[PDB]
Write a protein that binds this ligand. Sequence first.
Ligand SMILES: *[C@@H]1O[C@H](CO)[C@@H](O[C@@H]2O[C@H](CO)[C@@H](O[C@@H]3O[C@H](CO[C@H]4O[C@H](CO)[C@@H](O)[C@H](O)[C@@H]4O)[C@@H](O)[C@H](O[C@H]4O[C@H](CO)[C@@H](O)[C@H](O)[C@@H]4O[C@H]4O[C@H](CO)[C@@H](O)[C@H](O)[C@@H]4O[C@H]4O[C@H](CO)[C@@H](O)[C@H](O)[C@@H]4O)[C@@H]3O)[C@H](O)[C@H]2NC(C)=O)[C@H](O)[C@H]1NC(C)=O
Ligand SMILES: *[C@@H]1O[C@H](CO)[C@@H](O[C@@H]2O[C@H](CO)[C@@H](O[C@@H]3O[C@H](CO)[C@@H](O)[C@H](O[C@H]4O[C@H](CO)[C@@H](O)[C@H](O)[C@@H]4O)[C@@H]3O)[C@H](O)[C@H]2NC(C)=O)[C@H](O)[C@H]1NC(C)=O
Ligand SMILES: *[C@@H]1O[C@H](CO)[C@@H](O)[C@H](O)[C@H]1NC(C)=O
Ligand SMILES: *[C@@H]1O[C@H](CO)[C@@H](O)[C@H](O)[C@H]1NC(C)=O
Lengths: 129, 53, 103
Amino acid sequence: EVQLVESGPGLVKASETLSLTCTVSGYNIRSNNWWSWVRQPPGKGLEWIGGVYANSEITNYNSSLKSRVSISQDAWRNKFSLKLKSVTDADTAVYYCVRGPNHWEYFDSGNNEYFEFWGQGALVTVSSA
Amino acid sequence: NNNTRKSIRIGPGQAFYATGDIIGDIRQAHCNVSKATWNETLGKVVKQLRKHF
Amino acid sequence: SALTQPPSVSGAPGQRVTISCTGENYHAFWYQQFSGMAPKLLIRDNDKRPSGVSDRFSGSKSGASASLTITGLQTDDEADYYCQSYDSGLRSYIFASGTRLTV
Ligand SMILES: *[C@@H]1O[C@H](CO)[C@@H](O[C@@H]2O[C@H](CO)[C@@H](O[C@@H]3O[C@H](CO[C@H]4O[C@H](CO)[C@@H](O)[C@H](O)[C@@H]4O)[C@@H](O)[C@H](O[C@H]4O[C@H](CO)[C@@H](O)[C@H](O)[C@@H]4O[C@H]4O[C@H](CO)[C@@H](O)[C@H](O)[C@@H]4O[C@H]4O[C@H](CO)[C@@H](O)[C@H](O)[C@@H]4O)[C@@H]3O)[C@H](O)[C@H]2NC(C)=O)[C@H](O)[C@H]1NC(C)=O
Ligand SMILES: *[C@@H]1O[C@H](CO)[C@@H](O[C@@H]2O[C@H](CO)[C@@H](O[C@@H]3O[C@H](CO)[C@@H](O)[C@H](O[C@H]4O[C@H](CO)[C@@H](O)[C@H](O)[C@@H]4O)[C@@H]3O)[C@H](O)[C@H]2NC(C)=O)[C@H](O)[C@H]1NC(C)=O
Ligand SMILES: *[C@@H]1O[C@H](CO)[C@@H](O)[C@H](O)[C@H]1NC(C)=O
Ligand SMILES: *[C@@H]1O[C@H](CO)[C@@H](O)[C@H](O)[C@H]1NC(C)=O
């Protein structure tokens, strides 16, 4: 029963880090599933970043762009907390946050973790002007 | 489950090793058993124990 | 390595059309996307159709490709469609670009 509401700065300027937090509602932030992000720049596909694995310190990233990000997971408030480092104007997109498949034992699905709950999506455009 | 240690301090030189967070979801703790084995083995107990009853 | 999809499709209503993907040894997942609306998972676990989606969708995996069929095309299905799957590029889900249904 997840309903992910997100809210970022609204308009970031170039070479300044932006941050978004996806408020989780109707569901705890401890269910053995991956808590991850994704972006959809107009045109190219649903480029993905990585997740946090509900409240551990364990992560995987998107080497397809690089290892800039350092996402955290602060619970007890149901925050989700992305952080993007060293942004240029090429990073503009619309950002979605999504959880995993809710495994039973910590890693049941070897490597599937398909993205099944896309909450709302939020967009931020990065520019010097 | 997969818990975490937190080190309270309760005096000069005394650390109390309390639990921190539970990482994951609360499944139960269990110990299975075979079932064809436990049925056979319980069937060897009755054959021997009939010798006294 | 990376996957690739036909850029576009077309077909009149009341039709049986399949959207096909390239290729691995893993499964594949299909996502729809309305214009201006957040994407939603539509087919997972090659067939294993989730709850709340139309029964008119049905996936299947071939020797090295997977395609999903749809019966009775309707205007509300003009959305894009994405082929999603992992690869052994060491990491990094390598789902291809989508194809938009045109009626
Ligand atoms: C001691 O003995 C006991 C038993 O005697 C041992 O415990 C057994 O352990 C088994 C494996 O560890 C376990 O099997 C699992 O059962 C799960 C139970 O599901 C519950 O919910 C469903 C509702 O959907 C009920 O119908 C069911 O009765 C249960 O109440 C299953 O959910 C598991 O199946 C999943 O994994 C298998 C294999 O991976 C898949 O074939 C299957 O389709 C399921 O796949 C889902 O989960 C994977 C995990 O990542 C996803 O990748 C996948 O996409 C699916 O996820 C979606 O679908 C599920 C719904 O199925 C949904 O919830 C999820 O959010 C996603 O949408 C698995 O089969 C036995 O149940 C368990 N027995 C008991 C009694 O607990 C114990 O291990 C023994 N001791 C030791 C030390 O070993
Ligand atoms: C049982 O209840 C207790 C409270 O009665 C609860 O303890 C709370 O734990 C959380 C998380 O451990 C604490 O939240 C902290 O809040 C402070 C101030 O808001 C932050 O500075 C902390 O964050 C730091 O660390 C994060 C990770 O590096 C950073 O993201 C962050 O920027 C900070 O560096 C943290 O969020 C909270 O303070 C306590 N409660 C009290 C009263 O102090 C506990 O979690 C409950 N049990 C369980 C199992 O949750
Ligand atoms: C117990 O666990 C061992 C671990 O390898 C496994 O080989 C064995 O089949 C298990 N037996 C039962 C009855 O659970
Ligand atoms: C298994 O247990 C049942 C329980 O009464 C018993 O009747 C049956 O004989 C057992 N099986 C064998 C092979 O002894």
